[model samples]
Target chain A: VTQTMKGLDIQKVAGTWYSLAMAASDISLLDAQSAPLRVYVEELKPTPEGDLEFLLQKWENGECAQKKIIAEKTKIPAVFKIDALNENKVLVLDTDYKKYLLFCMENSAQSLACQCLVRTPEVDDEALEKFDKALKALPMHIRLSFNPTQLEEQCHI
Target chain B: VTQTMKGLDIQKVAGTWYSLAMAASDISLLDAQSAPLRVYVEELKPTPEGDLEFLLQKWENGECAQKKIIAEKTKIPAVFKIDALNENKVLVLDTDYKKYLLFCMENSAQSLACQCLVRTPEVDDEALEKFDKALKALPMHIRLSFNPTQLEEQCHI
Candidate 1:
C-alpha cells in the first residue's frame, strides 16, 4: 500500500539530510531516533555486485551513534533496504536536491513503523500544509506521531 | 576576463556547501572563506522584488559568523552579488548538485579569486580527473593559482 518515485536518482539523493519530522505506528523514537537527527549517506556508487553503502549519524542522550550499512534497491523503485536491518524499507518520496521527503516503514505485518525526514529543520508553511495533508491521509489505525508546532533542542555532534 | 553560465536555477544552488580547493588572483580567503569552511544559503525563493535572499555561514577559530544576504541576478546570466559585499560577485562555473565549482572575482581587476567546493570531503579519481580538465581549461592567469593535487582539510562546520 506504500508508494515511491518511478525513477529515483539514488546518486543525486546521496548527501547529508536532516530529519524534520518523524512518526511511527509502533517503533520507539527514544531508543532508535535522534530528535531531529542528522543523516549522511555516502555516494551511491555501485560495487562489483551493485550495492550502495551509507553512513547514518544520530545523537541520543549526548552519545554519538554512527552506523555503516549497505542499501539495495527493491523491486519497487525508490525503495531500499539497510542490509541486515531486514524488516525496514527506506522510501524516498520526494527531493529536489534542496529539500527531500523520505518515508521509512518497518515490520510490515504486525505494525508499520514510519519515519519522515527533510534537509533542514525549518520549511515554509506551504510545505507543512502539504505535510499535514499527507499525514492525515494515512490509514485510521496508523498512529501519526509528531510535533510540528515545536522542535526538539539541538543535538550537538 | 572571467566566464559564467548562461542560465542558472537559483533554488538548485541553495543549500549547504564546503570549499574543497581554492586559488585566487588575489583575495584573502580567511576573511571571505569558510574554514575548510561550510557554506549554507537559505532557500533562494524569489522575493517580492523577485531577487533571492540567502544566509551564509562560516566558522573560524571556534567561532561562528553568520550573515543575511541577498543575491540579485546581473544583466549577465548566472551572476549574483551578496548585497553589500558589492566588491565581490559569485559565479557558478559547474554543479550537478553533488559538487559545485564557484568563481568569485573582485574589483573587476587584474586578479580574480576562486574556490572549488563540494558537498562532501571525499571525491574519487574520476571526479578529480574531470576537475583537472576543467581547471586546465580556465584562462592562464586564473589557471596557475590552483593545484588539484593538494586539498584543504576538515572544513568542519
Candidate 2:
C-alpha cells in the first residue's frame, strides 16, 4: 500500500471471507482447522519507494511462532480460499502464480493450532485435483489438529 | 484466558488488531493519533506454574517497529473505546475512580500524541467541571492505531 494514504482500512479485513484456492503452503496452514478463533493480519507498512509487496499474519499454538513471507512479486490480488468447514475442519486454498493448498483441521481433542502458508490462492473447477496433487508432493503426513476435548488427530491429505 | 481454554484462541493480543489509543512522553516513542493504526499482540507462553500468558508484539508503518505492552491479565473481556473522532481534534477518555471527579487529560496534534488516564472516556457537563479541578493530575494516553493514515489527536478533561 502507498504511504500517501494516512491510514489503511485495516478494519476492512474484519469480515468473514472464505478461501477459494491456495498454494501448497497456505493450504497446509489453514487446513489445520482446529486453530483457535484467532486474529490474523499482516504488517501494513509501505515500501518507501512504492515497492511491491504483501504481508499476512499466521497463527499457531506456540510462542516464537513468527514467520514472515518475503515474496518476489506484488501487484496482484491474492485470494485464499476456504474450501471446507464442517466438524472443526476447514480447507484453505492459495492462488497466485503459484499453486498451494492447506486445511484448517482439528484433532479429536482440539488442543493445538497450526498455520501453514503456501504460494497462491486460486479457486477453479480443477481445484480438487490440484489440491490432491500438491498434497501428494509433501514429504510428510501430518495430522493437522489434536483434540484436548477428545484427542482425535486431523490429517491434511 | 481460562487454563483449558487459553490455548484455543488467537485473540490473546496477537495477529493484527488496530490500535484504538496510545500515549507516552517521547516524540518518537509511541503515540496513538500519529500512526495510521496501532497494533500489538501477545506471544503466548507458560507462567511459572506452566499456564498460558501473553507476550506482546507491536508494529508500526508496516514493519515490526519496536514497542511493547505485556498482557498482565487474560481471559478478561476487554474493549477499546473511542472517545473522540470526526473533528479537527479528538478526545480520549480515562475514567478515574481514584480521583473524586477529575478525568485525566491527553492532548495531541495530528502527528504528536500523549495521554494520561482520565477520570472517564470523555468530558461532559459534570466531567468538564471536575476535569478542570483536576487539571494538574498526571494523565496517561493510549495508542489508537499502528499505521499512519487516519491520525487524530485526542484530549479531554
Candidate 3:
C-alpha cells in the first residue's frame, strides 16, 4: 500500500517543474510515441474551483506538442480526479515545494504510475532519495530517467 | 563478452518478423518517440551483394513510417555494418531462422542494443528463453516489451 503526503499545500506545488524520473506498472504507459502519461509537466495551477490545471509538453513524432489537463480535487487533500478518458486518481506522494515533487496516478486498471519532478533541469541527491523511497513502497515494473531536453526549446503552446 | 551465432545461414533467416522485446545499454535508445532503434522489422532480405536489407516500420507523429536499411556484410559470418549516420555494427546474436531471431547492434559509443523478434505476433516460451539467455550475457540497462500493433495496418512505403 502507498500513502499520499499529509497536508499537501496545493498552492506550494503550483509552479514550473521538470520531469526527472518516471515509473509505471505498464510499460506501454512509458512509451514515448504512444504513452498518454509520457508527458512533462510545465506548470501546475490551482484554479478557482480548487482544482489544479496542468500544463504539459511532449514529443509528438518529431515535433514538440503541448497539452492541458484539469485535475478535480477530491475529498482527500492530496488526491484528485484526473479528467481524462480513463478513471484516473492522482496523488501527491511527496514534495519539498522548493526542489522536488513526487506525483503518482492510478488508472481504472489499477496500474500505478509515478513521476519525480524537480524545479531545475538537474536533480539533486536528496530528490532522488525521496523518489527512490516512494518507489520502494509502490508496485513498479519499470523505472526510467526522463530527459526534458527533448522538449525544451521546441514547444510554443 | 557476447557471442554471435555460429554457422548463421543468412538465406534461411529472410522473412517477416515481429518485435517482441528489446534491450539497450542506453535507455534513450528504446524511447518509442525519439529513439532511432525503436523500429519493427517487417522483413529481412538476403541481398545480391551478400548483404542484408532490412524493411522496417515505425510510428512518426501520427502516421506509420517505413524505412529500408542495408546491412553490409563484414568479415565475420553473422556480423554486418549498418549503413547509417552512426557507425553501427550489427550481429545475429542467436536465431532459429524459423521461429525466433536475436539481433544486436553496437554503436560508436560502444552502447549495445538488442532485439528479440519472432515469426508471429505471439511469442512462445522457447523464444523468450533464448532472449533471456542472451540478456544475461549483455550489458543492458533496460529491457522493454515492444508492441508493433502501433504500426500495423498503417504503414505503406
TM-score of chain A of each: 0.63, 0.25, 0.87
TM-score of each model's chain B: 0.59, 0.25, 0.87
Which one wins by lDDT: 1 or 3? 3
The most accurate candidate by lDDT is: 3
Every candidate's fraction of true contacts kept comes to: 0.00, 0.00, 0.25
User: By TM-score, highest first, what's the ranking?
Assistant: 3, 1, 2
Return the lDDT, model 1, position A93.
58
Fnat of model 1, as a fraction? 0.00
Return the TM-score for each candidate structure: 0.37, 0.18, 0.57
- lDDT by residue (B1-157, candidate 2, tens digit) is 0011112322322222222233332212332212332333223243443233333344445444444322233333221112345222222232333321111122344232322222222323353343323322322121121212322221100
Alpha-carbon runs more than 4 Å astray in model 2 = A1-52, A60-69, A72-125, A143-157, B1-157
lDDT of each: 0.46, 0.28, 0.75
Would you give me the overall lDDT of model 1? Answer: 0.46
DockQ of each: 0.01, 0.01, 0.19
Q: Which residue pairs come into collision in candidate 3?
A: A61-B61
Better of 1 and 2 by TM-score: 1
> What CAPRI grade goes to candidate 2?
incorrect
Q: Model 3, A21: alpha-carbon shift in Å?
A: 7.3
* Candidate 1 vs 3: which has more DockQ: 3
Q: Name the candidate that leads on TM-score.
A: 3
What 10-residue stretch in candidate 1 chain A is worst by lDDT?
A140-149
